[PDB]
Amino acid sequence: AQVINTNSLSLMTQNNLNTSQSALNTAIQRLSSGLRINSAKDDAAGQAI
């Protein structure tokens, strides 16, 4: 139905861009840094060893 009050396709697309941005962020981070484990977030056990 043609409703102009709310547009629920732009909502989907907006909610969908974020999951791409996240991967972009991690990829750019790793390349410049020079290594893989930049925090304890990546995995806890490897950092300790």
Binding site: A1, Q2, V3, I4, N5, T6, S8, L11
Partner: protein, 48 residues
Amino acid sequence: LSASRSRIQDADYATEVSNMTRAQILQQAGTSVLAQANQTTQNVLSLL
């Protein structure tokens, strides 16, 4: 949740546009008919 609210709440256009046009035509028809019915009793005067 926003999508479900929109379904319960919003208004569709084509429906109301059609209803509006339909309402206007009956207005004009009623006004014309009222004038026509109103001029009826003039004809009695001719009788005298």
